[PDB]
Scaffold this motif. Structure first.
Motif, PDB file in Angstrom:
ATOM      1  N   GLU A 127      -1.918 -32.762  48.660  1.00  0.00           N
ATOM      2  CA  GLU A 127      -3.308 -32.667  48.217  1.00  0.00           C
ATOM      3  C   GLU A 127      -3.588 -33.667  47.100  1.00  0.00           C
ATOM      4  O   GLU A 127      -4.646 -34.292  47.068  1.00  0.00           O
ATOM      5  CB  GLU A 127      -3.629 -31.253  47.718  1.00  0.00           C
ATOM      6  N   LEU A 128      -2.638 -33.811  46.180  1.00  0.00           N
ATOM      7  CA  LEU A 128      -2.789 -34.748  45.068  1.00  0.00           C
ATOM      8  C   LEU A 128      -2.865 -36.190  45.562  1.00  0.00           C
ATOM      9  O   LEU A 128      -3.689 -36.973  45.090  1.00  0.00           O
ATOM     10  CB  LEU A 128      -1.616 -34.612  44.084  1.00  0.00           C
ATOM     11  N   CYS A 129      -2.007 -36.543  46.515  1.00  0.00           N
ATOM     12  CA  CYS A 129      -2.000 -37.908  47.039  1.00  0.00           C
ATOM     13  C   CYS A 129      -3.313 -38.298  47.705  1.00  0.00           C
ATOM     14  O   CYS A 129      -3.683 -39.471  47.711  1.00  0.00           O
ATOM     15  CB  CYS A 129      -0.848 -38.094  48.030  1.00  0.00           C
ATOM     16  N   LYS A 130      -4.017 -37.318  48.263  1.00  0.00           N
ATOM     17  CA  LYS A 130      -5.286 -37.587  48.922  1.00  0.00           C
ATOM     18  C   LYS A 130      -6.383 -38.022  47.950  1.00  0.00           C
ATOM     19  O   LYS A 130      -7.291 -38.763  48.330  1.00  0.00           O
ATOM     20  CB  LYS A 130      -5.742 -36.350  49.699  1.00  0.00           C
ATOM     21  N   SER A 172       9.835 -40.775  49.985  1.00  0.00           N
ATOM     22  CA  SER A 172       9.029 -39.950  50.878  1.00  0.00           C
ATOM     23  C   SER A 172       7.548 -40.314  50.797  1.00  0.00           C
ATOM     24  O   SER A 172       7.054 -40.708  49.741  1.00  0.00           O
ATOM     25  CB  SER A 172       9.220 -38.469  50.541  1.00  0.00           C
ATOM     26  N   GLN A 173       6.847 -40.179  51.920  1.00  0.00           N
ATOM     27  CA  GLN A 173       5.422 -40.488  51.984  1.00  0.00           C
ATOM     28  C   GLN A 173       4.649 -39.299  52.548  1.00  0.00           C
ATOM     29  O   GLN A 173       5.143 -38.593  53.426  1.00  0.00           O
ATOM     30  CB  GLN A 173       5.186 -41.714  52.865  1.00  0.00           C
ATOM     31  N   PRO A 174       3.425 -39.058  52.041  1.00  0.00           N
ATOM     32  CA  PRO A 174       2.778 -39.848  50.988  1.00  0.00           C
ATOM     33  C   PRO A 174       3.520 -39.734  49.661  1.00  0.00           C
ATOM     34  O   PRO A 174       4.249 -38.770  49.423  1.00  0.00           O
ATOM     35  CB  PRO A 174       1.370 -39.262  50.932  1.00  0.00           C
ATOM     36  N   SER A 175       3.317 -40.725  48.800  1.00  0.00           N
ATOM     37  CA  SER A 175       3.983 -40.779  47.510  1.00  0.00           C
ATOM     38  C   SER A 175       2.985 -40.816  46.349  1.00  0.00           C
ATOM     39  O   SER A 175       1.934 -41.455  46.433  1.00  0.00           O
ATOM     40  CB  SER A 175       4.875 -42.023  47.474  1.00  0.00           C
ATOM     41  N   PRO A 191      -7.352 -40.002  38.297  1.00  0.00           N
ATOM     42  CA  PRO A 191      -6.101 -40.477  37.701  1.00  0.00           C
ATOM     43  C   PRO A 191      -5.066 -39.384  37.464  1.00  0.00           C
ATOM     44  O   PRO A 191      -5.384 -38.319  36.933  1.00  0.00           O
ATOM     45  CB  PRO A 191      -6.565 -41.114  36.396  1.00  0.00           C
ATOM     46  N   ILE A 192      -3.826 -39.657  37.860  1.00  0.00           N
ATOM     47  CA  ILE A 192      -2.733 -38.708  37.669  1.00  0.00           C
ATOM     48  C   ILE A 192      -1.814 -39.205  36.551  1.00  0.00           C
ATOM     49  O   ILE A 192      -1.433 -40.379  36.523  1.00  0.00           O
ATOM     50  CB  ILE A 192      -1.887 -38.535  38.960  1.00  0.00           C
TER      51      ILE A 192
END
Ligand SMILES: [Cl-]
Length: 243
Positions: free
Chosen positions: A156-159, A183-186, A165-166
């Motif tokens: 969810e964060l990668c989306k 691993s992906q998504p990263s 901004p993280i």
């Protein structure tokens, strides 16, 4: 650009809190969490922003271990610093006393602490509601594969990581601490706050995409040298140093 392997990182922590040195987890975690908060405040200054802009929250996601603990501390300092922190604490180890105390401290400061369900945490992954996200899921002790619900959380964060901004605590969650993103998504953090000393995976960030800070100002010269690095030149009374 000096770094320390995850193996030595574990040895450092073990020594710091050993009988010889005498550091307590409470102190280190407080100082570490403080560092992260200071980095967020420096990267996202409140001066100038309008009241509407200041209404946004700092979404802190805390993991079940040490990394999450650092996040709980960070959230309290951010509240004191003038931000609107909101903590998502899905998995809590009901055996670690200090983590429970850190949560009570958040209640004391009226900082929301959402559960794995009741809190509809996904609402905080919207641009108009969140200023930035603090990734305090897993630290340098991370070892794949990642299990749920953290796997789905990272997805969810990668989306939305290219819009919101993280700020990653110590290391980007999901990255191979020594090998880097595999691993992906990263996770692609806007800010990385290495603690004590950066790990090998930190050399995989892109300066144009990620600002790098190091925190945890409690390392003497001889100790650092013993582990292959030099103590960082923190400026003034800062608990963080850019790069
Ligand atoms: Cl951890």
């Amino acid at each position: 650009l000096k770094v320390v392997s995850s193996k030595l990182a574990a040895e450092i922590d073990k020594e710091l809190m050993g009988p010889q040195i005498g550091f307590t987890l409470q102190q280190l975690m407080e100082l570490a969490g403080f560092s992260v908060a200071q980095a967020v405040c420096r990267q996202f200054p409140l001066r100038g922003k309008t009241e509407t802009e200041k209404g946004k929250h700092v979404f802190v996601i805390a993991g079940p271990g040490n990394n999450g603990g650092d996040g709980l501390v960070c959230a309290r300092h951010l509240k004191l610093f003038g931000y609107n922190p909101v903590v998502f604490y899905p998995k809590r180890s009901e055996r670690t006393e200090f983590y429970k105390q850190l949560v009570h401290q958040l209640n004391f400061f009226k900082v929301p602490v959402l559960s794995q369900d009741e809190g509809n945490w996904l609402e905080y992954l919207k641009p108009e509601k969140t200023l930035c996200i603090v990734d305090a899921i897993f630290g340098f002790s991370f070892k794949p594969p990642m299990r749920e619900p953290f796997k789905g959380i990272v997805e969810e964060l990668c989306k939305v990581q290219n819009i919101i901004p993280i700020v990653s605590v110590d290391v980007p969650t999901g990255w191979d601490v020594d090998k880097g993103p595999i691993s992906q998504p990263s996770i692609n953090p806007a800010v990385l706050v290495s603690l004590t000393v950066p790990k090998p995976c930190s050399s995989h960030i892109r300066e144009n995409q990620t600002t790098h800070y190091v925190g945890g100002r409690f390392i003497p010269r001889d100790f650092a040298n013993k582990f292959g690095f030099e103590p960082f030149g923190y400026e003034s009374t800062d608990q963080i140093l850019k790069l």
